[PDB]
Design a protein around this ligand. Structure first.
Ligand SMILES: O=C(O)Cc1c[nH]c2ccccc12
Ligand SMILES: c1ccc2[nH]ccc2c1
Ligand SMILES: [Ca+2]
Ligand SMILES: [Mn+2]
Length: 231
């Protein structure tokens, strides 16, 4: 199965599989049941920004999600990604809806990994119809209003259900290297989760996985496009 690490922006509490019973951000290590989470207020319809930070030195994966009004949620988790990820990965974004749904619009995404140096840095503030440096998967499409919609949206402006989608950066990343003194990465992305459903679902993740990683099957709704199941 795909080796996955992820920061999840989890708009839907699936508390029969580990979610806390609020909207939450989570660090996911090889499982969809977050090693760590934090209560997150998903502000409907607002543009949000997620920052994920990790370095090999402090070995603490962190993520803040916040919105323009100042609310903000943080999560950190002490872990050595040298022991969970393969040397070469892909990075990307993943989203899903299920029974409930939302827009999973990504408005920008930037990523930096370094190995001190080797370094890879990319930034998308405007995505194209034909984004040739993004591998799109499942429902994800880009363009031409400069957005990445990771989950199937519908003409009048509408989040459908039972949708998954991800975009990985095309180039694989060398995310660690054992002689590296420092192997760090940060990623940032801004998103617009909107819903008029009774509850939005299910969320946006930033993820690193093996380079060949795909959408496991039946991974919509609560498995966020990251896992074959909820183990
Ligand atoms: O793409 C975005 O909207 C985030 C963006 C990446 N580089 C930046 C530098 C300064 C301010 C915003 C951004
Ligand atoms: C509560 C907890 C987990 C879940 N997975 C799908 C529906 C659902 C509800
Ligand atoms: Ca969930
Ligand atoms: Mn969760």
């Amino acid at each position: 199965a795909d080796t996955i690490v992820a920061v999840e922006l989890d708009t839907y509490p699936n508390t029969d599989i580990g979610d806390p019973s609020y909207p939450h951000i989570g660090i996911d290590i090889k499982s969809v049941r977050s090693k760590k989470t934090a209560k997150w207020n998903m502000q409907n319809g607002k543009v949000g920004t997620a920052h994920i930070i990790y370095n090999s030195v402090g070995k603490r994966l962190s993520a803040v999600v916040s919105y323009p009004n100042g609310d903000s949620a943080t999560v950190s988790y002490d872990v050595d990604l040298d022991n969970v990820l393969p040397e070469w990965v892909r990075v990307g974004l993943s989203a899903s809806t299920g029974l409930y749904k939302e827009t999973n619009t990504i408005l920008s995404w930037s990523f930096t990994s370094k190995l001190k140096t080797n370094a890879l840095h990319f930034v998308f503030n405007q995505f194209s119809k034909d984004q040739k440096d993004l591998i799109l998967q499942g429902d994800a499409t880009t363009g031409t209003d400069g957005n990445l919609e990771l989950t199937r949206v519908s003409s009048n402006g509408s989040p459908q259900g039972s949708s998954v989608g991800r975009a990985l950066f095309y180039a694989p990343v060398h995310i660690w290297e054992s002689s590296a003194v420092v192997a760090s990465f940060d990623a940032t992305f801004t998103f617009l989760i909107k819903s008029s459903d009774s509850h939005p679902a299910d969320g946006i993740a930033f993820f690193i996985s093996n380079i060949d990683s795909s959408i496991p099957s039946g991974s919509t709704g609560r498995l966020l496009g990251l896992f074959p199941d909820a183990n």
